[PDB]
Amino acid sequence: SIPWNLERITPPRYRGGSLVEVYLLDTSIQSDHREIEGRVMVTDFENVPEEDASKCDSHGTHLAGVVSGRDAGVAKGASMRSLRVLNCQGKGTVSGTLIGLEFIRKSQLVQPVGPLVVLLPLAGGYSRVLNAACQRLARAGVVLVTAAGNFRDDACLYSPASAPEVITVGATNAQDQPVTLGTLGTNFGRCVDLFAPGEDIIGASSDCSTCFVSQSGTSQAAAHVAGIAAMMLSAEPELTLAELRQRLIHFSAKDVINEAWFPEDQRVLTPNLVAALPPSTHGWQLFCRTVWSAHSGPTRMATAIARCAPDEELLSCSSFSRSGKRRGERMEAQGGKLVCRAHNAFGGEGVYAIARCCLLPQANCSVHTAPPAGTRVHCHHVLTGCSSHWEVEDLPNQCVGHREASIHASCCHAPGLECKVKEHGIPQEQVTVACEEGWTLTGCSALPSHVLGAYAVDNTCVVRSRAVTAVAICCRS
Amino acid sequence: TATFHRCAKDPWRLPGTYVVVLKEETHLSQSERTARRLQAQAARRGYLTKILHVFHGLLPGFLVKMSGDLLELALKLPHVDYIEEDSSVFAQ
């Protein structure tokens, strides 16, 4: 009887959402529906284009149900407030969406409540202003959950999916694979943060006050994450956006999607996560995420940059290029805060910077750098990452680089931190080394015979080559 | 330094309405005057405009219904950061 999606997001060990409010920006809703009646407050904010009765409120009633419905909802308690930014055909405007996000911020200022989750189950093309509005509303302390988009495309070309500081959800099906239907299906790419159930999702149906229907979409998937977030923020009201996003990542099922559904260039960029409620168990622990930069572009002096959240530490930095024409990566200070910067080589199509960002409080972290000479630096606390960058066009707690490159050590004064280094070499297109259970991969890199790049995938260090040795740095309390 | 942006997906563009976005520290009183100035300068040129909304709280700026002919004029207004042509969003 338990619908497949609600079982799917249930942790392997288990036992809400009421100090939290979930705002919904969607079509009108049938607030009388027994799934949601008494739970959803229609603000009657309305800003919609003109069309070109139960069809009208079908979308939003379903999603209101997926978040908070009493039989089929993720956060079965959950107060919701609904705004109407989509007309009866499901069409809205950027400007209307702007006014609704503005309306939520005015309400919060007039009548402060607790943690706020805004669900944006909608998409249009990349929009500077919509992304700006979403970010600034996030910086004001509000959590935004948005759908990746249903176009089987790069989510970074869509808004508010591409919006900075927002949680973008793609859709997976009952086989844990990305939804595909014809040429349509879930978006993907580095702007997607995780995936949630989004095919054949039973929820409230506006046909009648006790009726139910199945719908699919990345809206449905985001509705899952929004109810998941509402329960996390009920349990831990004080979470910052980085701390909630590190928990969503940590508690997701991992390496469960078959990356072959994604276009080749997007497999490395798309996170292999399916969202899940946290278990009954949860002492402090070390959370890290991998943060990919936008592609640098082809200019000869191009740099990609990857940044952590203000309350995260940059524990390592690497780079990747599909052709292998790259000049490595370095860590630099900006605003008293370390960022990850990758260098394009003259004649390459661009590179990615790949930061490893971790919630490590009480951490004083510094960089140790050595110029070209093989090249060596070391710390003199604990080594968390090795980086390397060169100026030429071709060829313990220590880092070692090519004789002609600089190398950089991320060194952290972190008492209570223990780190170990684990290596794996083979005679080979991809070489892999993973941290043991309970440890967190903080740093990944290849020993200096022609490397496309290295990047952390969860707790596995992955080195990509055209003897090759993968080197993983693993830490824990 | 002010720039214009419209949706790269042509069928989603909504010409005729523009989101005029102002520099981060711009005060509501300035937004209202900058909108009134646009209306004024457009009227001196023969264009009716309509200020559909003034933004404050997340972004300063305003939403104007006007012919695109005025984008060169509107981009030179005080406090302007960029202008974006409205476009569609869709249930997903």
Binding site: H59, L181, L184, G185 | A91, Q92
Partner: peptide
């Protein structure tokens, strides 16, 4: 669904 992958992928 027309004209944006709307309503369960059209």
């Amino acid at each position: 669904x027309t004209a944006a992958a709307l309503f369960s992928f059209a």
